[PDB]
Amino acid sequence: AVEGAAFQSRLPHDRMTSQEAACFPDIISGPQQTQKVFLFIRNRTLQLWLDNPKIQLTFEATLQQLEAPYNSDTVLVHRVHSYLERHGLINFGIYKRIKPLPTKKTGKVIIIGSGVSGLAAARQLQSFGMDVTLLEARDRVGGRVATFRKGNYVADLGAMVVTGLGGNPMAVVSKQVNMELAKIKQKCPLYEANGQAVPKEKDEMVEQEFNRLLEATSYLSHQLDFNVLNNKPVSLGQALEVVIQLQEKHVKDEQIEHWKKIVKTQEELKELLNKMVNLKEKIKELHQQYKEASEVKPPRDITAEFLVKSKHRDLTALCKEYDELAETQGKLEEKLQELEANPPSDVYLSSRDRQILDWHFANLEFANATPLSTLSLKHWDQDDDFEFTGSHLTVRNGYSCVPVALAEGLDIKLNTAVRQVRYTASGCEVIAVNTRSTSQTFIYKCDAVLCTLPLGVLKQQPPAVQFVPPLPEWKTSAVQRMGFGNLNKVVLCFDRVFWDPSVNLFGHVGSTTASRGELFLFWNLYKAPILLALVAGEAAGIMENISDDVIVGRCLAILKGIFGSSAVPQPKETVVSRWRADPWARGSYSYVAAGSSGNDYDLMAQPITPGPSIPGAPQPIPRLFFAGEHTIRNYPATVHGALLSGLREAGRIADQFLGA
Amino acid sequence: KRKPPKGMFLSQEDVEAVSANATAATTVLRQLDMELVSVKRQIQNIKQTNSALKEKLDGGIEPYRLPEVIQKCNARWTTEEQLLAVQAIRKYGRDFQAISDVIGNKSVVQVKNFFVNYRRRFNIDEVLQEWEAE
Numbered sequence: 001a002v003e004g005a006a007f008q009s010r011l012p013h014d015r016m017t018s019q020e021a022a023c024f025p026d027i028i029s030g031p032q033q034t035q036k037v038f039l040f041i042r043n044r045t046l047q048l049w050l051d052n053p054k055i056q057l058t059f060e061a062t063l064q065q066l067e068a069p070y071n072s073d074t075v076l077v078h079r080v081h082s083y084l085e086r087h088g089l090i091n092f093g094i095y096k097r098i099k100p101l102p103t104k105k106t107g108k109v110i111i112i113g114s115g116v117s118g119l120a121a122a123r124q125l126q127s128f129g130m131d132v133t134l135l136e137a138r139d140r141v142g143g144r145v146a147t148f149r150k151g152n153y154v155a156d157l158g159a160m161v162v163t164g165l166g167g168n169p170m171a172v173v174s175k176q177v178n179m180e181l182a183k184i185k186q187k188c189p190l191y192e193a194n195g196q197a198v199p200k201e202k203d204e205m206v207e208q209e210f211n212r213l214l215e216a217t218s219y220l221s222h223q224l225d226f227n228v229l230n231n232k233p234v235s236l237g238q239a240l241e242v243v244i245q246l247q248e249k250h251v252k253d254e255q256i257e258h259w260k261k262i263v264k265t266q267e268e269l270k271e272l273l274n275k276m277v278n279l280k281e282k283i284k285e286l287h288q289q290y291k292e293a294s295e296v297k298p299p300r301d302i303t304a305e306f307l308v309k310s311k312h313r314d315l316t317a318l319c320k321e322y323d324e325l326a327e328t329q330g331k332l333e334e335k336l337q338e339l340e341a342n343p344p345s346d347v348y349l350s351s352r353d354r355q356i357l358d359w360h361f362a363n364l365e366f367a368n369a370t371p372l373s374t375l376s377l378k379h380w381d382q383d384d385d386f387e388f389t390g391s392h393l394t395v396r397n398g399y400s401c402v403p404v405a406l407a408e409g410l411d412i413k414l415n416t417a418v419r420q421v422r423y424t425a426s427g428c429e430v431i432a433v434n435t436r437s438t439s440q441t442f443i444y445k446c447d448a449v450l451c452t453l454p455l456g457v458l459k460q461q462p463p464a465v466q467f468v469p470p471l472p473e474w475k476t477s478a479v480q481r482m483g484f485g486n487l488n489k490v491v492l493c494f495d496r497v498f499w500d501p502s503v504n505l506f507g508h509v510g511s512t513t514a515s516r517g518e519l520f521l522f523w524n525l526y527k528a529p530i531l532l533a534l535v536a537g538e539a540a541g542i543m544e545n546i547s548d549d550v551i552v553g554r555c556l557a558i559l560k561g562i563f564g565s566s567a568v569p570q571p572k573e574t575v576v577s578r579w580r581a582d583p584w585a586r587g588s589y590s591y592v593a594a595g596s597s598g599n600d601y602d603l604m605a606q607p608i609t610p611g612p613s614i615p616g617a618p619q620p621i622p623r624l625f626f627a628g629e630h631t632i633r634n635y636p637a638t639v640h641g642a643l644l645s646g647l648r649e650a651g652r653i654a655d656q657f658l659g660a
Numbered sequence: 661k662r663k664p665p666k667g668m669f670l671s672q673e674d675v676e677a678v679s680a681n682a683t684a685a686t687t688v689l690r691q692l693d694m695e696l697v698s699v700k701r702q703i704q705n706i707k708q709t710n711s712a713l714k715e716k717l718d719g720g721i722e723p724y725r726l727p728e729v730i731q732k733c734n735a736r737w738t739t740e741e742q743l744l745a746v747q748a749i750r751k752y753g754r755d756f757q758a759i760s761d762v763i764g765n766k767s768v769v770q771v772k773n774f775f776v777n778y779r780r781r782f783n784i785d786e787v788l789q790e791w792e793a794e
């Protein structure tokens with residue numbers, strides 16, 4: 001009901017967020033009754049916007065549809081509505097405006113980059129009445145949302161999945177944009193060396209082992225505190241080795257305990273056999289002796305009779321004794337025939353197995369766009385608590401539709417590469433050049449800069465962008481500490497659909513471990529006959545130094561040895577992403593590197609406040625603001641996270657220069 | 661967290677063991693590899709030896725057993741049976757089971773009986789101290 005809207009906005013329906021504590025200190029510290037009133041007004045306003053995000057939810061309309069005792073306090077309602085709208089929880093994206101834009105504007109903001117985070121801020125700021133200009137190095141909007149288009153071919157080289165609509169702000173964007181969303185059939189065959197579908201029985205043992213191995217590292221981390229080793233911090237990959245090794249050690253340990261109890265039994269038998277030989281020997285004599293004593297025929301005295309009767313008793317004693325020893329020798333003889341037939345597993349994982357496991361690892365390198373040797377063991381999964389609900393979707397018609405949509409109405413300067421950012425007590429100048437002719441230079445002066453430069457660009461060892469004054473250590477160190485990963489695609493365009501049209505994805509299992517990322521996964525998502533080949537893990541970095549033709553070579557091979565050397569045409573069109581080489585990206589997206597933590601994401605997001613111009617003038621206003629995928633702790637490395645960070649900075653900038 | 665997945669093994673102990681240096685891993689694994697071959701070949705050995713001992717038993721104890729009649733237990737001590745007795749007491753001491761098996765028609769009952777009925781004129785005390793000399 002109303003409680004569903006809170007969930008769709010990533011908010012608890014039943015308590016107040018620490019954000020809200022900050023703007024409604026009255027409420028949070030007050031009567032629990034009013035808190036419930038607040039929460040209901042909040043939840044109901046959210047519901048109203050969410051139920052029709054195609055048009056602006058004015059304060060009028062909100063109080064109108066408020067019922068019961070709640071439209072009683074109209075100042076409280078106007079408060080809640082404004083809070084929601086400043087922070088971008090309602091009237092965000094592309095809506096029809098009701099109250100039209102301010103005639104005269106207030107403040108000026110330069111936004112660096114028109115990726116989704118830049119664009120989202122730009123729209124918010126513009127709807128708050130500010131003057132917004134975006135500077136974009138590329139000749140297109142969208143940044144790392146990059147759709148390839150030619151004829152009817154269409155293929156995302158950047159973001160391509162909406163990872164669930166439950167609580168995803170792109171839920172709202174897709175209601176607002178012609179966004180053609182398609183469920184992903186989440187079954188995926190695996191094809192090996194010479195080209196053989198992996199038996200389903202196998203696929204599932206390895207997958208189950210993969211997952212068991214992950215939980216193992218989590219226990220290895222949280223329970224045993226296996227987090228520092230040799231003064232460096234432990235990576236996920238390190239911990240995976242250590243877990244795998246310990247499983248091999250335990251396999252050997254069991255073979256030892258087994259054969260070691262075969263030998264204990266073999267030595268028990270031996271001890272018995274000996275008693276039994278030295279009874280056969282002892283009995284042999286007793287026979288001879290009894291036989292000789294029987295040679296003395298029975299006209300015989302009593303000592304001679306005692307020696308016949310004695311040797312006889314003696315002889316049948318040693319005879320029972322040896323018979324019980326030869327039943328004990330039969331119980332032993334079979335206990336040992338069983339152990340010889342109950343041998344623990346010969347291996348932990350076979351070679352065929354460990355290469356299928358290596359594909360499940362490449363799948364994990366692909367999601368986190370980086371080698372598992374770089375991910376923090378302790379923190380690599382720290383955003384997992386915040387997963388959306390529902391199926392994962394692809395954008396059938398190209399994700400670029402979203403940026404292009406957001407860009408409508410905005411002042412976007414393309415082919416403008418920012419070079420230096422200057423921020424002072426009085427304001428800022430951004431210096432940019434024309435990417436076509438390097439020499440043509442531009443000076444933009446503004447009240448505030450929103451930096452949405454990719455983490456990979458901010459990381460560039462010889463700076464691609466100079467900050468004046470330089471960013472403080474707390475910010476640069478966060479920048480050095482987290483990872484910016486990599487992940488590339490091959491797009492294959494054909495005349496005839498020759499794959500199985502009912503399968504969305506399917507795998508290729510690498511020969512070696514090193515090459516587990518190399519073209520390990522294939523996507524069929526689009527109308528046209530298009531196939532996408534991912535290059536994940538350590539392959540991505542390397543495959544970029546290989547010509548386009550070789551890459552598509554290796555590609556058509558893999559497909560031929562899977563579909564038949566004859567069903568596989570040449571491709572009409574090929575593209576090969578190279579994100580690490582792209583100078584407006586320098587990689588694909590961020591990842592919590594070993595030694596980092598989601599705390600660095602928050603450091604990324606703190607605004608910078610220049611010092612006073614005149615000595616002893618009061619401490620200024622903050623002037624440099626950061627948004628972007630790498631600035632949002634709970635949703636890094638996604639589009640919704642970019643968008644959220646844009647909405648965040650917009651509200652914060654407006655709170656600063658227009659007051660709250 | 662909590663306790664490791666079921667069937668993974670991750671003792672504290674082990675982890676320092678495979679981490680404390682760079683090849684401490686493929687060492688602890690190689691030394692177990694060998695302690696295996698070691699124990700396997702010492703099974704090959706006790707098998708060869710047990711196989712030989714088995715040859716020396718071929719025949720069992722078959723041409724060596726003697727039937728053990730019946731002798732329905734009586735109760736009169738014939739002069740023969742007393743003389744067997746006193747000789748069994750010198751060969752066996754108190755193994756009243758063997759002593760009854762030698763005599764044949766006396767059971768551990770009268771064997772214990774006799775021991776004190778005749779204890780005097782068969783100088784049974786002296787006889788037993790002879791067996792104790794052992």
Ligand SMILES: Cc1cc2nc3c(=O)[nH]c(=O)nc-3n(C[C@H](O)[C@H](O)[C@H](O)COP(=O)(O)OP(=O)(O)OC[C@H]3O[C@@H](n4cnc5c(N)ncnc54)[C@H](O)[C@@H]3O)c2cc1C
Pocket residue numbers: 112113114115116117118135136137138141142143144145157158159160161162163416417418419452453454457464465487488579583584585587588589627628629630636637638639640642
């Ligand atoms: C291969 C790949 C696949 C992905 N797949 C998915 C997916 O399936 N789902 C998902 O949710 N997310 C996905 N992502 C992540 C998502 O694409 C990004 O997190 C998000 O689009 C980036 O938004 P941003 O606004 O922070 O940065 P960007 O979109 O990179 O925007 C930054 C902008 O700044 C510009 N710029 C750089 N330097 C300068 C300069 N000197 N002057 C001016 N402008 C400059 C850049 O050209 C760019 O336009 C993927 C990313 C990659 C690389």
Ligand SMILES: Cc1ccc(-c2c(-c3ccc(C#N)c(F)c3)nc(N3CCC(N)CC3)c3nccnc23)cc1
Pocket residue numbers: 158159160161163184366367368383392487636637638
């Ligand atoms: C079929 C399928 C495959 C992968 C995912 C997936 C992705 C993903 C999707 C598409 C592309 C492309 N092209 C891509 F590159 C990454 N990204 C995930 N991450 C990024 C790191 C962040 N820390 C947390 C969210 C993620 N997380 C959990 C589960 N599935 C995913 C979803 C569906």
